[PDB]
Amino acid sequence: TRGEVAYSGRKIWPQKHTGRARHGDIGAPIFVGGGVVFGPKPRDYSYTLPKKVRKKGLAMAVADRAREGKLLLVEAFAGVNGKTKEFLAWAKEAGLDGSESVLLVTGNELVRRAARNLPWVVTLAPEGLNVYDIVRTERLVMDLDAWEVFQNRIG
Amino acid sequence: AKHPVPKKKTSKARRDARRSHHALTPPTLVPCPECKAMKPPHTVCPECGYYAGRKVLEV
Amino acid sequence: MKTYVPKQVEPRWVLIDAEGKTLGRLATKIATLLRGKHRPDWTPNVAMGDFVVVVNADKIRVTGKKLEQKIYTRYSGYPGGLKKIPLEKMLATHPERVLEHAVKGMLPKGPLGRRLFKRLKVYAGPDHPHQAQRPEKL
Amino acid sequence: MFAIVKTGGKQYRVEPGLKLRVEKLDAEPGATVELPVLLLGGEKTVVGTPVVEGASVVAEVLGHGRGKKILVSKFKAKVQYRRKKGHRQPYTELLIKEIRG
Amino acid sequence: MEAKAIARYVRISPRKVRLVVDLIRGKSLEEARNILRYTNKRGAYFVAKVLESAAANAVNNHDMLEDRLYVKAAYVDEGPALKRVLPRARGRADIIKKRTSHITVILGEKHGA
Amino acid sequence: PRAKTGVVRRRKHKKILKLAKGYWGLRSKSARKARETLFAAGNYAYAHRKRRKRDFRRLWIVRINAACRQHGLNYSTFIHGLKKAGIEVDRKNLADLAVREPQVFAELVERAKAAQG
RNA sequence: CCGUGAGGGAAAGGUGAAAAGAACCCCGGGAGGGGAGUGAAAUAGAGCCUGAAACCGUGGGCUUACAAGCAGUCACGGCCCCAAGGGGUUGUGGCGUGCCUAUUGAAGCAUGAGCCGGCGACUCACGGUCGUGGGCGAGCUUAAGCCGUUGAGGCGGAGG
RNA sequence: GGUGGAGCCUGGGAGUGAGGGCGCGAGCGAUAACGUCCGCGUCCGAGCGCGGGAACAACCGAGACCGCCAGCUAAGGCCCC
RNA sequence: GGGAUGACCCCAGGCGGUAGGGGAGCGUUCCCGAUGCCGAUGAAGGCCGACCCGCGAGGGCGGCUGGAGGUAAGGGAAGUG
């Protein structure tokens, strides 16, 4: 604001029989040095979305994805000690070729380390399930324990 | 500044037109006889000088 | 669309004098001729007019009392520089000027207006010092 | 020959080979149109009354087209009133074939 | 072929030197030289020296043959003025521009056999 | 975020300076002497099209009159004729018959005064 | 820099990948050029990337010394430039009271404006009240916080 | 009778709250004023857009979405401009 | 009014306009779209264009410069003309 600018408040020239235009201080917003008018201040863009609408969204988001034929919840993970190598091999057998992007949720931290660095896969703990991450991805893959918690998160 | 002042900025047209008579005349010259040179008339000039008459330096 | 518009018209010379004609009622006709206005190429921006030679000017009749009464006028740019001259005296000298003034005022006032006026040739006479044709009009 | 045909609320002196443009005729792009709409001939047909009766000039529509754009601008002073219209008149081009009356 | 000169930044008003340039446009180098020599104008000197330089170039650089030379084209563009404080009555204080010139002269050859 | 003017102003301005080609002096150079000029130019054009349509009605009439004056009668009367005759045709435009093909004009006159005996 | 002083308070970024930053010759007192030379590029040559406008030049086309004007516009015609079509210019004809503001009323002899470029004015927080897109419904909803994330979301019914 | 950019009802957003001329009817004024105050009407305002009136907000004609090198009229005009 | 709703065609009205009210757009900065796509066979910006689309705000295309960045559809935010 004009108020927050360093310049002093001295009146810059008389006001009257100068022959120049009228002015107070050089911090005014017609002044180059001066303050900006309704410029941004820091503020908070958060707001509290209805929890229920969140349940709905989350439920639906998966559903669209189920309807698509993309939801595949699994059990097999011999792809252990989170090595990208191991996961990838495992993925091949599961027909996850990397031709579409994939959202993998699971509580098993080793499979999490396993993908991650793959650039077509978005890795995720189940409490982190959320529509955006769901939607941005083309294909959805869940641990059955992850599908269990997803159950609880609705009803 | 005070009393009279110009009322309107003057056109480039009206300016260049006032300057119509500003072009200079080329200096008026002729050849030094007895010397190979272009001087103004009625003047002793150091290419030559004159005859039985004073000038720069010549042998 | 037609640009009916002509290529340089071969202008006409005409000799005209109803010596005992009301000026004005003459002058009106003169003018019409001066703009190519009788002719059906009339072209407003061009001067495809006639050349009109008035012979035996002076003589011009005029209605009511318009000598000492019609007053021709000249303001020389000066103080006191209005001059008023009766028509009597215009006839009495420069009679060829009487008809001219009356015609002028009836022609358009631009540059062409001026150019056509010079296609009007007026002689207190008769005898017209240019033999260059002259279908006499009556 | 000669012929003064009328189309679009406008008349035109046509001839065995030319035409210009003349406003939307609902005519198939390359078709034939009779402009039975007709006055005059080059050996003095005239018209007894408006249209010479079973006289028609055939023209061949070459094609359709919007004219060159005009910019129609309106302005009012001391009242902020400024307005742009782009306008292009569409037409059809004909070629006069024959004047058969 | 042509030969060019240009004296950048001469420090004399353009308005003022054009005066002498316009005195020699389209002239043999022989003409020009006499013309400048007896022209009564500070600018003649700067223009003389630029015209002389172009001749050297013509001859020495593009082998162009002196007697054939003339002033094809020549002109002066203003350079960036020096702005300068000039004090007036009542405290007033003006800025004065010391104008500076970019004089150019370009020679070519004449007629033939 | 900040959205400075950037490029935008320079362009509204030289859109308009294009339209100003060939105007005298500053009217073709000043971002805004051009502008002014062009409002007025714009109105001139609009009304002047209206006028063009009246300016030619006028021209035609005057050489129609001329020509039919060549055969005794005049334009007041001549139009009466055409009117009655039913030949609302001529369309002052197309009494350029006056010039190209007077033959044809001559007739037209005849038919005209025939409606009037 | 200004002011005795308290105090006031600017401006000013950018070669190029690499300085390879132009030996040597030429005109000049130098400053500057012209050749040579480096470079992918020198109208990248040193306050050197990009280089708009005002403004000033040079050349070329059309044009003007008996016409009167808000400077344009409509029409014809001429001459100039690539082609049954354009582009430029303007001779004559018709028409024509600048822009903004303020006013009952402005071409106005009422205000503002030398021109060009950039900067420059209806917003955000919390409450309210209409409307609208949705969620659930005799119910709806959570705050602070707590846990989880490390651009993940949960929990939390004090309260309203 | 009358379907009209009529009406009535509920709500959101206004701007205006400085008028001007003309005609008619009164007051004031001097049966003065481009005067002043109301009343009915109208236009300018916002229609300094178009035609007439030499020129000219509000007198006459007439309510301008765009185009035409078509036609018929309005007021007012038809000796020349 | 059709109604193979086609937002595509007929039928009828209307479309001067200041304060104002409403409705549809254009363009600027930034965000998701993006670990993507365009870019040295030349980005952004600049100089022309009598060419194309748009009622317009504008959008393309073509040549010249420029020399390294730019950013769809469809959404979102504002130091937005």
UniProtKB/Swiss-Prot annotation, chain A:
Keywords recorded for this protein, A-Z: Ribonucleoprotein, Ribosomal protein, RNA-binding, rRNA-binding
Post-translational modification: The N-terminus is blocked.
Protein name: Large ribosomal subunit protein uL4
Subunit structure: Part of the 50S ribosomal subunit.
Full protein: residues contained: 53 to 207 of 210
Lineage of the species this protein comes from: Bacteria, Thermotogati, Deinococcota, Deinococci, Thermales
UniProt superkingdom: Bacteria
GO CC aspect terms: ribonucleoprotein complex; ribosome
Single GO BP term: translation
Function: One of the primary rRNA binding proteins, this protein initially binds near the 5'-end of the 23S rRNA. It is important during the early stages of 50S assembly. It makes multiple contacts with different domains of the 23S rRNA in the assembled 50S subunit and ribosome. Forms part of the polypeptide exit tunnel.
UniProt record similarity statement: Belongs to the universal ribosomal protein uL4 family.
Gene Ontology MF, one: structural constituent of ribosome
Organism: Thermus thermophilus (strain ATCC 27634 / DSM 579 / HB8)
Residues in coiled coil: none
UniProtKB/Swiss-Prot annotation, chain B:
InterPro entries given in the database record: Ribosomal_bL32, Ribosomal_bL32_bact, Ribosomal_zn-bd
GO biological process entries: translation
A Pfam family per the record: Ribosomal_L32p
Annotated keywords: Ribonucleoprotein, Ribosomal protein
Gene3D superfamilies per UniProt: Single helix bin
Disulphide-bridged cysteine pairs: none
Disordered: annotated segments: 1-29
Residue ranges with Basic residues bias: 1-22
Gene Ontology molecular-function annotations: structural constituent of ribosome
One cellular component term from this protein's GO annotations in UniProt: large ribosomal subunit
Family, as annotated: Belongs to the bacterial ribosomal protein bL32 family.
Summary of subunit composition and partner proteins: Part of the 50S ribosomal subunit.
Function per UniProt: Found on the solvent side of the large subunit.
Protein name, entry field: Large ribosomal subunit protein bL32
Gene name tied to this protein: rpmF
UniProtKB/Swiss-Prot annotation, chain C:
GO cellular component entries: cytosolic large ribosomal subunit
Residue ranges that the Swiss-Prot or TrEMBL entry lists as coiled coil: none
GO MF entries: mRNA binding; structural constituent of ribosome
HAMAP family noted in UniProt: Ribosomal_uL13 (MF_01366)
Protein function: This protein is one of the early assembly proteins of the 50S ribosomal subunit, although it is not seen to bind rRNA by itself. It is important during the early stages of 50S assembly.
Subunit structure: Part of the 50S ribosomal subunit.
Domain of life according to the entry: Bacteria
Gene Ontology biological process terms from the UniProt entry: negative regulation of translation; translation
Name of a matching Pfam family: Ribosomal_L13
Gene3D superfamilies noted in UniProt: Ribosomal protein L13 (3.90.1180.10)
UniProt keyword annotations, A-Z: Ribonucleoprotein, Ribosomal protein
Protein name according to UniProt: Large ribosomal subunit protein uL13
Family, as annotated: Belongs to the universal ribosomal protein uL13 family.
UniProtKB/Swiss-Prot annotation, chain D:
InterPro entries attached to this UniProt entry: bL21-like, bL21-like_sf, Ribosomal_bL21
GO BP terms in the entry: translation
A single cellular component GO annotation: ribosome
Keywords, in A-Z order: Ribonucleoprotein, Ribosomal protein, RNA-binding, rRNA-binding
GO molecular function: rRNA binding; structural constituent of ribosome
Stated role: This protein binds to 23S rRNA in the presence of protein L20. Found on the solvent side of the large subunit.
Family according to the record: Belongs to the bacterial ribosomal protein bL21 family.
Complex formation: Contacts protein L20. Part of the 50S ribosomal subunit.
Protein name: Large ribosomal subunit protein bL21
